[PDB]
Amino acid sequence: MRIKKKNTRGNARNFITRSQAVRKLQVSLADFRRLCIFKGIYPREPRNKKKANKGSTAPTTFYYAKDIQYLMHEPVLAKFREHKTFA
């Protein structure tokens, strides 16, 4: 086993920032906030925020990566896309 990279597992993989989540979901910020409120997704706080955000101390919103992955399956997102096409 070769040497692993130093910002890929642990807090870095456990948490995802809001902009990364919005990009991954391929939706707007308004849609992301609406979906999080509908599904009970809430911001979390890493114990090691520098490790979660590449040493940055800037104030960021963190979500669980698995929660965002689960949100990716909600049919309400497909309903949002259908509404956009209708508009």
- Least distance between RNA and beta carbon 13 (Å): 8
Quote the least distance from Cβ 39 to RNA, whole Å. Answer: 15
Nearest Cα neighbor of 18 from 81, 75, 65, 80 is 65
Count interface residues toward RNA (CB under 7 A). 40
Under a CB-based contact definition with an 8 Å cutoff, are residues 43 and 62 in contact? Answer: yes
SS3 72: coil
Binding interface with RNA (CB under 7 A): 1-12, 17-20, 22-23, 27-31, 46-48, 50-51, 54-61, 80, 83-84, 87
